[PDB]
Amino acid sequence: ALLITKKCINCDMCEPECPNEAISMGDHIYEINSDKCTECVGHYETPTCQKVCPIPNTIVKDPAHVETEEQLWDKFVLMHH
Ligand code: SF4
């Protein structure tokens, strides 16, 4: 799953887009919920928030290492048959 890094400049571009509504605003910058991010696997060939992002601030994150079939299985449990 992805993370948004401190360069985020709070443009909201990325929130209406995420197919699994895992992005929200909070304390200082937009935040991605680890639990709900499939890195867009089952919806887009490329992670839709990196796509909209004007700055390139969204990165894979290291304390939330997922293999592609665990991303996949998140997508199927979320959206399902
Ligand atoms: S990579 Fe996809 S699922 Fe994850 S926060 Fe971005 S738009 Fe959402």
Ligand code: SF4
């Ligand atoms: S699109 Fe990029 S700069 Fe704008 S809020 Fe989302 S992560 Fe931050």
